């Protein structure tokens, strides 16, 4: 009774909240039930009470992310009374729905499409599941459908749509979806439909990446975790089925009077299976030691990956061209775990993990910076350096140092607050007094006055190479600690070198050759040969005064590919672009669209076109463009960006 | 407890509104759907577990029939 109460309360509610809020709601309900002396089993997971092993395996085959939030979302999607409204900014939910309902020929549609109504009627006539990708522009014809305003006349189950009557089929089901995660719906909407929130949060991506690396790495121990699942699903299953077989074989009751009770052998088999399951529960206690170890070893990796992806997400603020989808970061992850040449000759788990995290940081930077302005590469490198600094255990947080390094200018001074040190300018004096507020830099004025090598160093061409040891500390600092201290010294002292010195800082954290790939010319051959999907367009966004046509034309020439290049200036250009794309999607040739920034709306329509299209393996759509905010955000998110 | 669950959902929505995050109205239709889902889950879990409980109960006196045979 209590179990079903909690499970139903979680199914009906909690369909819109994130993982933490769902957990808090479940905890509050459980605490109240305990207060009321209602017995509910605590050991079970809500994701397991409402789900079966076979349906879970089908979901896994249907590319359901291993996230617990996504598991609960799938459970809510299977069992419902009001038609779901899927809020998936990531886009995984649409793929999962189509894979799950492919056998039932699910049809995609959008509200903006005029044929939608007709398709709806077909979905009402043949009882086929239907998906709508855009419901922000609601058309209220579903109000009778959502309310289930059925009429049972004769043998007919009938509904009123507009001024027409359409017969219902029980096999019919509709699935509303929104890509926008921040849209607000009117109260009637949140009453008619249940919500299935698919937004990726910090804990969500942490768990998803943890499970991904658990499956990919330690494949033998991945099979050990699978065996953890088996003992619940096979050893327990074998135990119970052998119990029922014993019961049936004894239920035969053959040979009356005669001693046919040879069921004792099956009793021994029952005891063997029961002891096997109990010892496998003890092995799950070992899992609280061993599989917990396999999880906690990769926990820093998943934490750093969640931090990386949300750093990419918040990178959208500093420029309108820095739009990275979750699928791009998942492709980065898959290229790190799989198809990684650096893992071919390494078998030890610890070395594989360290190499994987290093390749993660390196490939993430090398993929992001390719579509990122040269003045900002150091910023993203510094962000990744801070992420890895947080990842490292022995190294201190350096929270105060970075806080000062970012917010020194906000500290208010006075004319008397500057002692006017000889050899130091007024602004340099302000920087000195502001930086002296820190404890490790308290004696900075004394060192400044006492030192004599200061005069040469301050006016040196490259002071950052030979920053003197001014700051006084009780214990020796880490090399990265020395790097951040010297970074603060450079910022206060010679801010012009700051940028350059920042490079050294990242070289102290992420290796000397971290940005070393940025300096070579962009090797387009391997970029387009692999690691980019034929569906995904290659965006070449160049600042005004530069054309990227030559690089990719040479790319096509050297690979012996007949490329069709079309400029986008008029409706005839639109027709030629569409014809070329329709030829090349099946033939396999490469296609090129120049100056697509001239037509933003047509760019949106083109993005919608590539969304529902499976092209040939050799298909490559290049879009050469100018960097202006008129370019649609969806095309930027749905394509690989090159600057 | 069901009433408390509805009130707790209302309180959580109000707290999220106070914190400035997006909140979504919890109508009494949500309560109706919750009660219907409680009915469905309780009925299905009972129709499985109590059905096999009937099987187990028949087996419980099957052992007594075997005891009768042993006494014979």
């Amino acid at each position: 009774a209590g179990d079903c109460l909690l499970s139903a309360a979680f199914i009906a509610y909690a369909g819109y909240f994130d993982q933490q809020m769902r957990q808090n709601l479940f905890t509050t309900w459980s605490h109240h039930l305990q207060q009321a002396n209602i017995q509910f089993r605590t050991d079970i997971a809500r994701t397991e009470y409402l789900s079966n092993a076979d349906e879970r395996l089908r979901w896994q085959a249907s590319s359901l992310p291993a996230d617990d939030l996504c598991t609960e979302n799938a459970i809510m999607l299977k069992r419902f009374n009001r038609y779901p409204l899927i809020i998936d900014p990531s886009g995984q939910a649409t793929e999962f729905i189509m894979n799950e309902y492919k056998d039932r020929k699910i049809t995609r549609t959008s509200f903006l499409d005029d044929a939608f109504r007709k398709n709806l009627e077909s979905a009402l006539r043949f009882g086929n599941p239907l998906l709508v990708q855009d419901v922000e522009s609601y058309d209220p014809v579903l109000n009778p459908v959502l309310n289930r305003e059925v009429r049972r006349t004769g043998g007919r189950v009938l509904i009123t749509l507009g001024d027409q009557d359409i017969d219902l089929s029980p096999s019919f089901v509709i699935f509303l979806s929104t890509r926008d995660p921040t849209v607000e719906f009117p109260p009637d909407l949140c009453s008619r439909v249940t919500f299935v929130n698919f937004t990726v949060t910090r804990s969500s991506l942490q768990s998803q990446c943890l499970n991904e690396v658990l499956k990919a790495e330690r494949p033998d121990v991945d099979e050990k975790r699978s065996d953890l699942l088996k003992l619940q699903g096979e050893f327990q299953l074998r135990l119970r089925q052998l119990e029922k077989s014993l019961l049936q074989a004894l239920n035969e009751v053959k040979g009356r009077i005669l001693d046919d009770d040879t069921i004792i052998t099956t009793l021994e088999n029952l005891k063997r299976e029961a002891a096997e399951v109990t010892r496998k529960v003890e092995e799950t206690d070992i899992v609280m030691q061993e599989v917990e170890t396999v999880s906690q070893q990769y926990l820093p990796l998943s934490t750093a990956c969640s931090s990386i992806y949300f750093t990419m997400e918040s990178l959208k603020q500093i420029h309108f061209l820095y739009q990275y989808s979750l699928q791009f970061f998942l492709d980065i992850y898959h290229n790190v775990l799989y198809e990684n040449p650096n893992l071919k000759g390494v078998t030890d788990h610890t070395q594989r993990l360290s190499i994987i995290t290093k390749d993660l940081f390196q490939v993430a930077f090398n993929r992001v910076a390719r579509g990122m302005l040269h003045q900002d590469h150091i910023t993203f490198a510094m962000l990744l350096a801070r992420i890895k600094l947080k990842g490292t255990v022995g190294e201190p947080t350096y929270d105060a140092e970075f806080q000062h390094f970012l917010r020194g200018n906000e500290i208010v001074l006075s004319a008397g607050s500057t002692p006017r040190i000889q050899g130091l300018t007024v602004e340099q004096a302000e920087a000195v007094v502001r930086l002296s507020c820190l404890p490790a830099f308290k004696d900075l004025i004394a060192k400044v006055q006492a030192d004599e090598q200061f005069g040469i160093w301050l006016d040196s061409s490259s002071p950052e190479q030979t920053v003197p040891y001014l700051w006084s500390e009780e214990t020796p600092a880490t090399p990265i600690g020395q790097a951040i201290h010297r970074l603060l010294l450079i910022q206060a002292f010679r801010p012009d070198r700051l940028l350059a010195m920042a490079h050294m800082f990242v070289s102290t954290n992420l290796g000397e050759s971290f940005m070393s790939i940025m300096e070579q010319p962009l090797d387009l051959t391997h970029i387009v040969g692999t690691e980019v999907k034929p569906n995904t367009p290659v965006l070449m966004c160049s600042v005004p005064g530069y054309d990227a046509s030559g690089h990719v034309e040479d790319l096509a020439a050297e690979q012996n590919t007949q490329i069709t290049s079309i400029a986008i200036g008029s409706a005839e250009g639109f027709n030629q672009a569409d014809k070329a794309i329709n030829t090349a999607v099946k033939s396999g040739r490469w296609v090129m669209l120049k100056n697509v920034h001239l037509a933003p709306g047509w760019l949106m329509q083109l993005e919608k076109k590539l969304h529902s299209l499976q092209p040939h393996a050799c298909f490559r759509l290049f879009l050469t463009m100018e960097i202006n905010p008129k370019v649609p955000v969806n095309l930027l998110r749905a394509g690989r960006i090159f600057v | 407890s069901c009433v408390f669950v509805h009130q707790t959902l209302h309180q959580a929505n109000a707290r999220l509104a106070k914190r400035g995050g997006r909140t979504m109205a919890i109508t009494p239709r949500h309560y109706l759907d919750f009660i219907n889902h409680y009915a469905n889950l309780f009925h299905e879990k009972r129709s499985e577990l109590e059905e096999q409980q009937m099987h187990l109960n028949v087996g419980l006196r099957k052992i007594k029939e075997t005891v009768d045979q042993v006494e014979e």
Side-chain angles (χ1 to χ4, degrees):
Chain A
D3 299 359
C4 266
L5 162 54
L6 285 195
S7 303
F10 174 110
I11 287 174
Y13 308 145
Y16 183 79
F17 308 75
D18 48 358
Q19 269 200 304
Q20 194 214 60
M21 224 46 250
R22 292 183 183 187
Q23 187 39 59
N24 260 2
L25 288 181
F26 209 107
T27 301
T28 53
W29 305 336
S30 305
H31 182 38
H32 182 275
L33 282 191
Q34 299 288 53
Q35 275 164 202
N37 287 10
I38 311 301
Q39 315 171 234
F40 63 98
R41 95 212 300 172
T42 314
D43 58 353
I44 183 65
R46 36 182 173 282
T47 89
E48 255 298 2
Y49 188 21
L50 309 160
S51 66
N52 197 12
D54 293 359
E55 58 182 278
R56 247 176 291 112
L57 259 64
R58 294 184 316 119
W59 298 344
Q60 300 324 117
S62 296
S63 79
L64 176 76
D67 185 16
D68 315 300
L69 181 88
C70 294
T71 303
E72 298 160 357
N73 291 356
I75 278 174
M76 229 164 314
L77 254 167
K78 164 211 185 170
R79 332 159 75 119
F80 63 92
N81 284 176
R82 294 164 290 146
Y83 286 112
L85 172 42
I86 311 157
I87 313 180
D88 47 350
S90 69
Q92 309 160 116
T94 304
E95 171 157 28
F96 156 91
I97 289 307
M98 301 276 207
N99 293 7
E100 267 278 290
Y101 303 145
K102 187 178 290 295
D103 48 352
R104 333 178 79 233
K105 65 212 58 52
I106 164 176
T107 310
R108 202 190 291 193
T109 315
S110 174
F111 272 18
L112 314 205
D113 307 359
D114 36 36
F116 156 53
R117 175 190 212 121
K118 168 50 62 175
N119 315 339
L120 188 49
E121 310 176 287
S122 67
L124 298 184
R125 276 207 295 250
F126 311 172
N128 300 329
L130 182 162
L131 201 163
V132 179
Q133 204 143 358
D134 313 316
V135 305
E136 319 94 319
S137 309
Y138 198 0
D139 159 8
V141 288
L142 325 172
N143 264 337
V145 178
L146 295 188
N147 289 300
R148 307 166 172 284
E149 290 216 9
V150 303
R151 64 141 71 90
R152 185 66 36 84
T153 288
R156 305 173 60 196
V157 189
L158 182 33
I159 320 87
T160 303
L161 163 154
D163 53 345
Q164 200 200 135
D165 300 300
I166 308 184
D167 195 292
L168 187 68
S169 173
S171 307
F172 154 79
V173 59
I174 186 167
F175 290 118
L176 307 118
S177 179
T178 82
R179 292 222 211 90
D180 187 8
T182 189
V183 71
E184 300 282 61
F185 285 125
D188 52 355
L189 264 291
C190 46
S191 208
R192 314 290 170 180
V193 303
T194 179
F195 289 127
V196 183
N197 195 2
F198 263 109
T199 53
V200 287
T201 75
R202 203 91 60 171
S203 64
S204 172
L205 221 51
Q206 285 167 2
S207 265
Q208 186 164 353
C209 288
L210 183 45
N211 288 354
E212 181 44 57
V213 70
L214 275 194
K215 170 200 57 181
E217 279 325 298
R218 296 170 64 119
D220 54 303
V221 192
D222 156 52
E223 185 267 355
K224 298 306 170 301
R225 183 204 69 241
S226 82
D227 294 353
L228 170 152
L229 271 73
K230 297 302 102 178
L231 73 96
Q232 310 164 58
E234 313 272 311
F235 292 172
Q236 183 266 355
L237 173 71
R238 220 65 54 176
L239 179 45
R240 191 60 205 73
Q241 298 337 112
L242 170 136
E243 260 285 349
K244 87 98 176 177
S245 308
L246 180 157
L247 294 201
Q248 299 319 115
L250 169 59
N251 247 339
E252 312 303 75
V253 179
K254 305 183 57 55
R256 175 65 203 182
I257 315 298
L258 179 68
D259 314 328
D260 298 63
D261 44 358
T262 88
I263 214 58
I264 322 299
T265 304
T266 56
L267 291 174
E268 167 265 355
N269 299 130
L270 154 78
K271 186 49 64 184
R272 305 285 74 66
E273 287 287 303
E276 181 198 9
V277 182
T278 59
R279 293 173 266 121
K280 285 327 168 285
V281 180
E282 308 159 6
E283 186 263 304
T284 66
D285 164 61
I286 311 176
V287 158
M288 173 57 257
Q289 311 307 129
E290 61 103 356
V291 165
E292 92 90 30
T293 297
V294 189
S295 303
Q296 58 83 53
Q297 61 168 175
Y298 304 143
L299 157 75
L301 206 180
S302 75
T303 312
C305 282
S306 69
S307 311
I308 279 178
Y309 177 61
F310 293 161
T311 297
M312 311 215 308
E313 200 196 288
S314 308
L315 267 206
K316 91 190 294 180
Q317 309 254 344
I318 70 172
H319 207 291
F320 53 87
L321 206 82
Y322 301 169
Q323 297 294 39
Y324 305 110
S325 46
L326 177 71
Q327 190 64 23
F328 177 63
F329 169 72
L330 261 306
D331 271 1
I332 274 190
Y333 209 107
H334 287 348
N335 192 278
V336 165
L337 292 185
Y338 306 159
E339 73 204 349
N340 197 9
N342 297 114
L343 290 152
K344 168 62 50 175
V346 180
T347 79
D348 186 20
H349 309 298
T350 79
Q351 332 298 335
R352 280 191 72 110
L353 167 62
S354 68
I355 282 185
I356 276 172
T357 206
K358 188 201 314 298
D359 292 316
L360 158 77
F361 275 131
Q362 175 74 236
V363 172
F365 174 80
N366 295 345
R367 290 223 196 179
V368 172
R370 274 331 191 190
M372 229 188 91
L373 281 293
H374 186 255
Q375 63 174 351
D376 312 308
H377 289 183
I378 181 59
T379 64
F380 187 50
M382 277 262 296
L383 291 172
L384 298 195
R386 288 205 58 182
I387 288 178
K388 192 193 185 62
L389 160 73
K390 144 162 171 53
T392 321
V393 177
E395 289 207 354
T397 71
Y398 296 129
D399 214 337
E401 286 79 6
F402 268 114
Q403 158 69 200
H404 177 247
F405 164 88
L406 290 176
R407 319 212 80 198
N409 330 299
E410 296 81 310
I411 303 299
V412 181
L413 305 182
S414 300
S417 306
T418 65
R420 200 96 190 201
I421 313 102
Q422 180 264 349
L424 258 51
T425 82
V426 286
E427 57 270 357
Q428 291 201 22
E430 314 170 28
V432 169
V433 61
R434 289 216 268 261
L435 191 143
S436 75
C437 183
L438 268 71
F441 285 113
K442 151 168 290 312
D443 303 308
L444 183 71
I445 283 278
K447 316 142 186 296
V448 152
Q449 285 280 4
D451 211 318
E452 195 272 334
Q453 273 172 220
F454 204 163
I456 318 170
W457 175 90
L458 188 77
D459 269 358
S460 177
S461 165
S462 63
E464 79 277 358
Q465 282 278 356
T466 49
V467 177
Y469 185 102
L470 292 92
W471 71 97
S472 60
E473 52 195 290
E474 293 84 5
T475 60
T478 79
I480 294 93
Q482 289 186 1
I484 170 55
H485 284 117
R486 296 169 201 275
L487 178 49
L488 272 172
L489 274 183
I490 283 303
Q491 187 212 5
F493 264 30
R494 286 278 305 285
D496 56 299
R497 302 307 304 170
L498 183 69
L499 207 74
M501 152 74 152
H503 279 54
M504 254 172 30
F505 177 74
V506 169
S507 295
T508 301
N509 275 305
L510 275 43
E512 208 284 333
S513 60
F514 194 68
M515 282 136 278
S516 62
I517 308 314
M518 288 345 299
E519 62 158 28
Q520 286 74 222
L522 199 150
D523 190 289
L524 260 181
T525 55
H526 164 249
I527 287 316
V528 302
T530 59
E531 101 166 276
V532 67
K533 308 320 293 172
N535 164 17
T536 303
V538 170
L539 305 185
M540 277 147 161
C541 315
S542 56
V543 296
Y546 204 110
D547 181 15
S549 303
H551 327 309
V552 48
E553 290 271 40
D554 159 79
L555 171 62
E558 300 290 25
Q559 284 202 342
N560 189 30
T561 308
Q562 295 294 322
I563 183 164
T564 302
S565 73
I566 292 302
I568 296 306
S570 180
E572 292 92 358
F574 293 178
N575 304 357
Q576 276 115 34
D578 299 0
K579 165 168 290 323
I581 218 167
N582 291 356
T583 302
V585 57
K586 59 182 102 182
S587 54
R589 304 161 141 201
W590 290 10
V591 85
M592 171 156 300
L593 298 192
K594 311 170 182 307
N595 321 125
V596 294
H597 60 293
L598 269 66
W602 182 78
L603 267 201
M604 291 215 88
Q605 276 167 21
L606 188 32
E607 195 277 303
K608 288 302 294 180
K609 184 177 301 179
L610 294 305
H611 216 313
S612 64
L613 173 142
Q614 287 86 18
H616 213 57
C618 284
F619 188 67
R620 287 298 187 282
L621 167 92
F622 301 90
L623 308 171
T624 70
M625 96 166 38
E626 281 248 357
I627 303 178
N628 40 15
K630 219 150 299 316
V631 174
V633 79
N634 286 321
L635 185 69
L636 292 185
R637 282 170 65 81
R640 179 140 184 172
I641 307 166
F642 282 113
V643 160
Chain B
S1 300
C2 295
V3 172
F4 169 86
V5 161
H6 208 62
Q7 303 223 133
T8 305
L9 255 286
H10 269 147
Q11 273 163 229
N13 226 357
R15 196 161 38 70
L16 253 52
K18 196 72 190 295
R19 214 192 300 240
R22 285 191 339 269
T23 65
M24 256 274 163
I26 312 196
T27 81
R29 203 182 311 231
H30 281 197
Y31 187 62
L32 290 203
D33 197 5
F34 156 62
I35 290 293
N36 189 6
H37 276 139
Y38 191 19
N40 299 355
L41 300 196
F42 196 66
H43 162 58
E44 92 165 18
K45 298 303 176 182
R46 200 56 162 290
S47 177
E48 272 166 59
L49 182 66
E50 181 179 301
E51 156 200 5
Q52 165 263 300
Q53 290 327 296
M54 254 198 69
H55 298 60
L56 171 81
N57 286 129
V58 177
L60 281 186
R61 194 91 216 283
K62 164 189 179 181
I63 271 64
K64 308 320 294 173
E65 313 308 299
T66 65
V67 166
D68 157 45
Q69 182 162 236
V70 159
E71 294 297 297
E72 159 267 301

